[PDB]
Amino acid sequence: GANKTVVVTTILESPYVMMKKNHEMLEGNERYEGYCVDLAAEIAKHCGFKYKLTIVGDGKYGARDADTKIWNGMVGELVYGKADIAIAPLTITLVREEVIDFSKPFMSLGISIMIKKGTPIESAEDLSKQTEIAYGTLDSGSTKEFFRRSKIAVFDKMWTYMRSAEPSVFVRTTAEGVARVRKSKGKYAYLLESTMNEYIEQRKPCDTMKVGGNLDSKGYGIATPKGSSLGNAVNLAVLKLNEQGLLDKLKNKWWYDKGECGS
């Protein structure tokens, strides 16, 4: 049949996808800006398709309910045919790979520790051995699931701590986690993807930093429904953009070129 406009699912998460300041004056894809907005346009240009950016209805990345077996988030939108492609900071994981297709990574990263400057923590092991400095994750997504599923002693101990700590150490959004670090006088450390930690470190008021090495290594991938014809071309586009240096330029654009915390 004739070509159709490709439905892209994504999520509002700075600096990946944001509504422009003047969005009310604008329409369609032009209402949005960010790393993933630019990436979507580059992929579409390379693959020769028209597309529509849509925002995932339930605000989630993607997980399967153990009782109903239903997939939520952007993964669910692909699984159930509501979107054709997901372009977002979506981690490639085994359980997702079983149900959707993923490109090779467009960004390599790991779980990391964000502290308020001056907090006496240098590693996950440091956090695990104490409780005075509380620590936690988003309440949904691959960072939380890493701890929940880990059989590594330090990370299992951290998960047991997080489930039992009071008040709750979980946050609903990145913005809430960052604000909690900033307002807690050194008594909250936030576990988050290194990409995001690096971005926030270059935002005013310049009071956070990434400490220690990453806890894992992984990647974000562009996702399509399993077996979708679009997957091959999208994957080749990711590889081409990487090989041309354009993914590095895009990260610099959104993370560092207008960083707010000096040079």
Ligand X SMILES: N[C@@H](Cn1c2c(c(=O)[nH]c1=O)COC2)C(=O)O
The contact mask relative to ligand X for 174-213 (x = CB under 6 A, - = no) is x-----------------xx--x-----------------
Distances (CA, A) of 49 to 8, 28, 157, 190, 216: 11, 16, 48, 39, 35
Give CA–CA dist 197/114, Å, rounded.
6
Quote the longest CA-to-CA distance of the chain. Answer: 62
132 binds a copy of itself (CB under 8 A): no
- Burial, 176: exposed, middle or buried (Cβ in 10 Å; 0-12, 13-18, 19+)? middle
Interface with Cl ion (CB under 5 A), residue from 1, 2, 4, 68 = 4
- Tell me if the bond preceding 120 is cis, omega within 30° of 0: no
The contact mask relative to ligand X for 26-65 (x = CB under 6 A, - = no) is -----------------------------------x----
Q: Which region, left, alpha or beta, applies to residue 85 given φ > 0 means left and ψ of -120 to 50 means alpha?
A: beta
The letter for the amino acid at 202 is Q
143 binds ligand X (CB under 6 A): yes
Buried b (16+ CB within 10 A) or exposed e, 234-248: bbebbeebeeeeebe
Residue showing the smallest CB distance to Li ion in the complex: 97
Interface with a copy of itself (CB under 8 A), residue from 185, 243, 262, 263 = 243
Q: Residue 213 corresponds to which tokens in the numbers above?
A: 């090495």
Q: Where are the alpha helices (DSSP H) in 48-152?
A: 73-79, 94-97, 124-128, 142-149
| 224 in a labelled binding site | no
| 142 in a labelled binding site | yes
| 96 in a labelled binding site | yes
The letter for the amino acid at 262 is G
Interface with ligand X (CB under 6 A), residue from 90, 113, 114, 209 = 90
108 binds a copy of itself (CB under 8 A): yes
Interface with ligand X (CB under 6 A), residue from 13, 33, 42, 101 = 13
Query: Which is closer to ligand X, CB of 142 or CB of 235?
Result: 142
| 193 in a labelled binding site | yes
Interface ranges with ligand X (CB under 6 A) = 13, 61, 89-91, 138, 141-143, 174, 192-193, 196
Interface ranges with a copy of itself (CB under 8 A) = 92-94, 97-98, 102, 104-105, 108, 146, 149, 151-152, 216-219, 221, 235-236, 239-240, 242-245, 247-248
Interface ranges with Li ion (CB under 5 A) = 97, 101
